[PDB]
């Protein structure tokens, strides 16, 4: 996947000169959102989809929260440059204009937008049954960050505290491995800790806008990472320094996947393993940061930034990424 | 589709109040781009895909122009609120990450971006074979328009001049009808009026940024319409007044589609029929408008806006929409 993308990223970088010295001049590609220079402030913009989570929603006739996943995926990324989310458009590529599916999608769109503080300002509906085997929901979000208040991770230093905010569950990454591994063996109706497998797989992605905007307005923040594709590897997008981490107990759907033979190092690169968002703050700000985040969701002191460049050591599981 | 979309549109309008009085407060949904209030200017933002034209690219193995279709679909829509395109992200949802395909997609991306004057600032690559039967390429673009310079069509008045700019060909709408009607009977190698069927179907969408930016900076412009889905019906989005039009002769791929049994009333509602972009200007600007446009592409005085309401009379074809 990354080797195929090389040609597109290189070409994209060549277009940057088109907006040189002009409104909207961009930063580099590779971070959680693009930054566009509008003088006093940057506009941040990111585009992200839900993934094959939508195939579970279809089987049980419940798209009621898939719009939450879409909104969460986009606005949580905007947070990772320090931006306040403002607006979103949605791209709905569908096999058919199913009024039942669309009515369900609409319910979660409002719930998500209110929690994220964004207006849904437009969108695109593409009915292409020869191209789409289902209902693929994506979107694009923009937000604003003042010049001088971008948070890319360049301020991360060894000794910084690393704090994790609990995920609500599987979120929207790793669904293809989980679907292929569990559904044929167990059935979608398989009951695990009092909920059906489809409920574990469909649990809507958590939205972190309110705790993170409160955090960055109260304490000095050096890095912010939304845990999506790549798992804990997303931390290396913030800094060259290493991490020493104690990850929380493996529970819920992650335990079920693990007990079905996925190696532990693979799942910390694929699933969020209970931690959906990670923040990096100076050690002296650790307790206030935890107090702020713990108002909103269960949060963990995970560990510390080290001088072991490039390594992520999950000490309590004996895994090094 | 419009029926299935009612609950999504209704719900999206209910989210507008989340940004009431804040940066990014939106205008209404329904137009070619969303308008976001940033004080002295609006940010315009739109999201659009290529459509099943990608199936033709995949069947023949030629992907080096669908990046042009994507960028054209998005930046041409930005023009229709009077905005200058600035930046675009691409959403590439694929069955497989083929490096040859991606290498070609990147050539067309660069050419579209340079002609449109936009930087490609990021994007998203979703590998989902259970959900995608090919290579679906879409994107989101943003532009800027100063307060007091928004061109919505509200200034359109009876008597105004209606000018059409030629398309390059089929552009990116109606491909589902053209593919299903023509390929099984003729094959993609069939020769028609000097070109193969696949060349008729894959001709890249024209980009109108340079002629339209010159036009709005030179003359008074009352409305701008990019001719996409719905064909000439897109004029009804600008105004409730009527139109009296003479459309150019039926040529090339539209002629072959017509000869294969699609009535002209349907094709003026599906295909651009030779006109890719329409502008409405007061009659005293008509000749200067034609001068400017004709320096970029073949353009036509199509007709006038009428005091009569709601109808689009294509006079020389005896058709009323
Ligand atoms: N098709 C694409 N076109 C342009 N840039 C892309 C594309 N896919 C990914 N990128 C860029 O590569 C980086 C990694 O993106 P991704 O792997 O989706 O992670 P994330 O969503 O967390 O940024 C991002 O900065 C993104 O903008
Ligand atoms: N899935 C969606 N969610 C929100 N708004 C949508 C969606 N699909 C279409 N719209 C809105 O409907 C209007 C028409 O959309 P569309 O038919 O794609 O035409 P266009 O690209 O010419 O605006 C646009 O204002 C768009 O923002
Ligand atoms: Mg993302
Ligand atoms: Mg559209
Ligand atoms: Mg469009
Ligand atoms: Mg992404």
Swiss-Prot record, chains A, B:
Gene3D superfamilies: PurM-like C-terminal domain, PurM-like, N-terminal domain. One of its GO terms (cellular component) is cytosol. Coiled coil: none annotated. It is an enzyme of class 6 (ligase). Keywords: ATP-binding, Cytoplasm, Ligase, Nucleotide-binding, Purine biosynthesis. It comes from the Archaea. Pfam families: AIRS (PF00586), AIRS_C (PF02769). GO terms for molecular function: ATP binding; phosphoribosylamine-glycine ligase activity; phosphoribosylformylglycinamidine cyclo-ligase activity. HAMAP family: AIRS. Belongs to the AIR synthase family. This is Phosphoribosylformylglycinamidine cyclo-ligase.
């Amino acid at each position: 996947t990354a080797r195929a993308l090389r040609e597109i990223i290189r070409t994209a970088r060549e277009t940057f000169k088109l907006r040189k010295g002009k409104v909207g001049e961009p930063g580099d590609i590779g971070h959680y959102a693009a930054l566009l220079d509008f003088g006093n402030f940057y506009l941040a913009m990111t585009t992200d989809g839900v993934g094959t989570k939508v195939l579970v929603a279809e089987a049980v006739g419940k798209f009621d929260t898939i719009g939450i996943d879409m909104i969460a995926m986009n606005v949580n990324d905007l947070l990772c440059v320090g931006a306040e989310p403002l607006a979103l458009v949605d791209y709905f590529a569908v096999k058919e204009p199913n009024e039942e599916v669309f009515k369900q999608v609409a319910k979660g769109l409002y719930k998500g937008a209110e929690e994220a503080g964004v207006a849904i300002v437009g969108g695109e509906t593409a009915v292409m049954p020869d191209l789409i085997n289902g209902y693929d929901l994506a979107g694009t979000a923009i937000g604003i960050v003042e010049k001088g208040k971008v948070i890319t991770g360049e301020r991360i230093r060894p000794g910084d505290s690393v704090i994790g905010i609990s995920s609500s569950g599987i979120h929207s990454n790793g669904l293809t491995l989980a679907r292929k591994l569990l559904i044929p063996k167990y059935g979608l109706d398989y009951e695990y800790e009092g909920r059906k497998l489809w409920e574990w797989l469909l649990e809507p992605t958590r939205i972190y806008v309110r705790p993170i905007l409160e955090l960055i307005n109260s304490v000095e923040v050096h890095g912010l990472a939304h845990i999506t594709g790549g798992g804990l590897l997303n931390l290396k997008r913030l800094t060259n320094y290493g991490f020493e981490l104690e990850m929380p107990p493996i529970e819920g759907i992650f335990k079920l996947i693990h007990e079905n033979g996925v190696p532990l190092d693979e799942m910390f690169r694929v699933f969020n393993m209970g931690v959906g968002f990670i923040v990096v703050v100076p050690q002296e700000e650790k307790e206030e940061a935890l107090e702020i985040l713990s108002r909103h969701y269960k949060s963990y002191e995970l560990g510390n930034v080290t001088r072991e460049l490039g390594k992520i050591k999950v000490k309590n599981y004996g895994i090094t990424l």
